[PDB]
Enzyme design. Structure first.
Site, PDB file in Angstrom:
ATOM      1  CG  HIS A 240      -1.879  -1.082   1.272  1.00 39.11           C
ATOM      2  ND1 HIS A 240      -2.867  -1.258   0.320  1.00 39.11           N
ATOM      3  CD2 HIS A 240      -1.962  -2.153   2.092  1.00 39.11           C
ATOM      4  CE1 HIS A 240      -3.538  -2.371   0.586  1.00 39.11           C
ATOM      5  NE2 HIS A 240      -3.023  -2.914   1.680  1.00 39.11           N
TER       6      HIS A 240
ATOM      7  CE  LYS B 256      -4.555  -7.325  -2.119  1.00 38.27           C
ATOM      8  NZ  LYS B 256      -4.417  -5.985  -1.512  1.00 38.27           N
TER       9      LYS B 256
ATOM     10  CG  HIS C 114      -6.939  -4.560   7.069  1.00 36.30           C
ATOM     11  ND1 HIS C 114      -7.225  -5.291   5.943  1.00 36.30           N
ATOM     12  CD2 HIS C 114      -8.100  -3.954   7.429  1.00 36.30           C
ATOM     13  CE1 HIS C 114      -8.495  -5.121   5.622  1.00 36.30           C
ATOM     14  NE2 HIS C 114      -9.046  -4.312   6.509  1.00 36.30           N
ATOM     15  CG  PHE C 115      -5.962   0.531   2.737  1.00 32.13           C
ATOM     16  CD1 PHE C 115      -7.172   0.678   2.073  1.00 32.13           C
ATOM     17  CD2 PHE C 115      -5.165   1.623   2.926  1.00 32.13           C
ATOM     18  CE1 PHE C 115      -7.559   1.927   1.612  1.00 32.13           C
ATOM     19  CE2 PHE C 115      -5.557   2.843   2.479  1.00 32.13           C
ATOM     20  CZ  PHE C 115      -6.739   2.993   1.847  1.00 32.13           C
ATOM     21  CG  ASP C 116     -11.604  -1.567   7.137  1.00 28.13           C
ATOM     22  OD1 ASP C 116     -11.536  -2.809   7.056  1.00 28.13           O
ATOM     23  OD2 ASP C 116     -12.617  -0.962   7.476  1.00 28.13           O
TER      24      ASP C 116
HETATM   25 CL   LIG Z   1      -6.805  -2.191  -0.518  1.00 31.63          CL
END
Ligand SMILES: [Cl-]
Ligand SMILES: [Cl-]
Ligand SMILES: [Cl-]
Ligand code: NA
Length: 124
Positions: free
Chosen positions: A12, A41, A119-121
């Site tokens: 990210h 992905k 984590h990217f929410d």
């Molecule tokens: Cl993402």
């Protein structure tokens, strides 16, 4: 064997550019960060801020994550992000992405010591 914090950085973080300036940004970045090995992905967001500024979000607004956990944090300010999403005509191994650049608040889940994003929410 990647740590959670390192996986977040690899998937990210893109501090080297201020914004996606081309329709091919996601195709190039999804490949170079090894997110198209073995599978495409389907969705991934890149953040164009310093790592320090993204880590600082773990001390900002505490909100629920989409899964109901309570270790998510929403940035107070908007940030430069690029959303990458597979198109309808994407098929492994020839992954193809749509690039959408935006300025939005980010929501991340934080864990650990140091307490950093894992984590990217979402973005808002
Ligand atoms: Cl993402
Ligand atoms: Cl890698
Ligand atoms: Cl509050
Ligand atoms: Na970690």
């Amino acid at each position: 064997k990647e740590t959670a914090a390192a996986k977040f950085e690899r998937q990210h973080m893109d501090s080297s550019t201020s914004a996606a300036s081309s329709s091919n940004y996601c195709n190039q970045m999804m490949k170079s960060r090894n997110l198209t090995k073995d599978r495409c992905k389907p969705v991934n967001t890149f953040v164009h801020e310093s790592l320090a500024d993204v880590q600082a979000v773990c001390s900002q607004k505490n909100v629920a994550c989409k899964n109901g956990q309570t270790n998510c944090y929403q940035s107070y300010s908007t940030m430069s992000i690029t959303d990458c999403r597979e198109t309808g005509s994407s098929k492994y191994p020839n992954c193809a992405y749509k690039t959408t650049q935006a300025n939005k608040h980010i929501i991340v889940a934080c864990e650990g010591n140091p307490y950093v994003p894992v984590h990217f929410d979402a973005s808002v």
